[model samples]
Target: TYDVNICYAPEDREWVINTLVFKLERAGIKTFVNIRDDTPGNFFAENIMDAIENSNRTIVVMSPDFFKNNICDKTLQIGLSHQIIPILYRPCEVPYFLNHMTYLDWCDKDVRPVFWRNLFRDIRN
Candidate 1:
C-alpha cells in the first residue's frame, strides 16, 4: 500500500496528525508526517522536498496561512512541479496556482457536505 504524507500547520500539535494517521490507517492508507514534532527544522524547503519525494501521496490540509505562507507555498510548489496529489481540507479558498490542479474538493454541505464528501472520498482513488 502507498503511504500518505500529511502536510499541515505547525500549530496543529501531535494529536491532530496522530488522530489523522490513525483514521487514514484504519481506512488503509499508510501515513507520514511532513512536519515532525513541534519544530520540524530550520530548512523548511528541504524538509518539504524530502517529504514530497519520499511519500506516495501528498495530503495537504489547506488553511488561511497555507496561502500566504512561503513554506506552505513552496510545499505546494514542489507538489505541482512534481505532479503530486494535493488534498485540500478546511474552508479556505484555494490559491490561483492550486486552483488549476486536479485536487479533491472538500467542504461540508451543512458546511457543504456534498462537496466535502465527494472531495474527501475521491482521495481514495
Candidate 2:
C-alpha cells in the first residue's frame, strides 16, 4: 500500500501535486498521484480506485479549481473512507461533506512547516 494517495485537480498538477510528491518521496514516503502513476489508455476510475485501495491516507489539495473539478470531486467522494488530509491552497468553501474536517493552511507561509510536520507524522503513524 502507498503511504499516501494524493487527490488533486489537474490545474494544480505541475506546481502542487508534482512538487509535493517529489518532497514526500525525498522524505522516504511512497505516494500515489495520478499524473505520476496512471497507466496509458486505462480507465480513469480504475486507476483512482486502485490508488485508493492501496493507500492508507489521501491528501486533498483544495483550491477554487479543485472545487470546480468534476474528476477531483468524484475521487474525493470515493476517498471518504480513507483518512483525508486537506491542504487549503486557496481561499474557497470546503466541500459540503467535509466542512467539519480540519485542514492545514498551506496558504500561509508561516504555517507551512507545521503542515508538513503534521503530514509527515500522519504518514508515519
RMSD of each: 4.1, 1.4
Reference-based TM-score of each model: 0.66, 0.92
**What is the lDDT of every predicted structure here?**
0.61, 0.85
Give lDDT: candidate 1, residue 3. Answer: 64
Q: Which portions of model 1 miss their true places by more than 4 Å?
A: 12-19, 35-42, 110-125
Per-residue lDDT tens digits for candidate 1, residues 20-86, read: 5666767676666654422254476666666677766677767675666666666766676554555
- Maximum-TM-score candidate: 2
In TM-score terms, candidate 2 sits at: 0.92
For candidate 2, write residues 60-106 as lDDT tens digits: 99988999999899989888876788888778988678788888888
lDDT, candidate 1, residue 33? 69
